[PDB]
């Protein structure tokens, strides 16, 4: 179709901007998921990008951890409004923290991501990340305002583990991945994944990487304007804040089924997507968030989903509610600065695709 050719052109023009490669999955209403890739999975081997190339989905992981949590609310074991002291009695200010503030980025919890070395071979415990957060981060009061929290999702994961007796990966697999047919999806912290199948991740030495968001010391020297950051960071360091590996095809499987009532009941879905407050993420299109989903505005279209940044892989997923379209676009180009073209610029092809969808619908 004309749409098919318009979309492949958007991806081609984006990789021509300097982006190593991009993988997209797009489901439109009354249609099968159609996949589009451009550029390379492996810059130096010139391997073409396919729809079978795995990516680290980074904070997109967060939409699954919320779902898993919401599933345990349906199970009757967890209450969104009850204090987390039940699970974390010694956590400062815990009594002011209902289960929902873990998910909604209003908890005031101190964060770990900006202090955590991105290059290491160190494995992390959930608790180890939490002690790290309080040691290096800044704690604000609950409900102070919106400030993106990874720590809240790490704590969310620990609730899941305690309530189900097994690692949070077991719950997400048995309740989400398995019944949906998601066969190319792993939870990094607790599961091994086929490294050989992953698209390589590229950090660009770019002029606009003026204010790196990560401690990337130990990177060594670049080669042909990039570092291969694929295996820089152990996923156990991100934990429930961003440890999942997947394909855009598998993610669209999840999204269609979530927005289609087939995972979460109508009340848990409403919490996730409709019970919202204003939200900010530096260099993104985020305007609001629920309890697991960021609302990201692209001109006259909006996606409910998530952004993901982990060194070298850069992802945007969501559903457009006005049009029914689901999409996961991931590039294997990244940088550190939020405002870098290599991070913030992933939003441009996403915008253009939603414009092409809209125009083909008129
Ligand atoms: C979301 O994309 C967060 N940046 C994921 C993350 C990555 C590293 C360490 C903690 C959280
Ligand atoms: Ba600087
Ligand atoms: Ba390493
Ligand atoms: Ba509109
Ligand atoms: Ba409107
Ligand atoms: Ba038209």
Automatic annotation (TrEMBL):
Signal sequence, start to end: none
Domain (Beta-lactamase-related) ranges: 10-336
UniProt xrefs under InterPro entries: AmpC-like, Beta-lactam-related, Beta-lactam/transpept-like
Pfam families found in the cross-reference section: Beta-lactamase
The name this protein goes by in its record: D-Amino acid amidase
Species in which this protein is naturally found: Brucella anthropi
């Amino acid at each position: 179709s004309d749409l098919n050719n318009a979309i492949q052109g958007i991806l081609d023009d984006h990789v021509a901007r300097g982006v190593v490669g991009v993988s997209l999955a797009l489901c439109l209403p009354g249609e099968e998921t159609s996949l589009y890739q451009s550029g390379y999975a492996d810059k130096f081997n010139k391997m073409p990008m396919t729809g079978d190339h795995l990516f680290r989905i980074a904070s997109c992981t967060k939409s699954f951890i919320a779902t898993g949590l919401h599933l345990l609310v349906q199970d009757g074991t967890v209450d969104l409004d009850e204090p987390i002291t039940r699970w974390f009695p010694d956590l400062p200010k815990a009594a002011q923290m209902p289960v929902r503030i873990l998910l909604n980025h209003r908890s005031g919890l101190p964060d770990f991501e900006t202090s955590m070395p991105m290059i290491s071979d160190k494995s992390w415990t959930a608790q180890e990340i939490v002690d790290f957060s309080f040691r290096h981060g800044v704690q604000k009061e609950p409900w102070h305002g919106m400030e993106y929290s990874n720590t809240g999702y790490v704590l969310a994961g620990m609730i899941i583990a305690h309530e189900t007796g097994k690692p949070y990966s077991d719950h997400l697999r048995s309740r989400i991945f398995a019944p949906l047919g998601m066969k190319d999806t792993w939870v990094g912290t607790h599961e091994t994944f086929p490294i050989e199948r992953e698209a390589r991740g590229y950090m660009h030495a770019a002029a606009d990487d003026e204010n790196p968001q990560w401690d990337v010391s130990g990177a060594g020297d670049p080669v042909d304007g990039v570092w291969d950051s694929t295996e820089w960071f152990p996923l156990s360091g991100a934990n429930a804040a961003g440890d999942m590996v997947s394909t855009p095809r598998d993610i669209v499987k999840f999204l269609n089924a979530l927005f289609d009532g087939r995972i979460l009941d109508q009340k848990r879905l409403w919490e996730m997507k409709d019970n919202i407050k204003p939200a900010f993420f530096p260099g993104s299109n985020t305007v609001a968030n629920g309890h697991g989903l960021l609302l990201m505005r692209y001109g006259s279209s909006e996606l409910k989903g998530h952004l993901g940044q982990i060194p070298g892989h850069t992802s945007i997923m969501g559903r457009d509610e006005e049009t029914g379209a689901a999409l996961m676009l991931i590039q294997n180009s990244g940088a550190g600065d939020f405002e870098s073209f290599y991070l913030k610029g992933v939003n441009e092809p996403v915008d253009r695709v939603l414009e092409a969808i809209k125009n083909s619908r008129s």
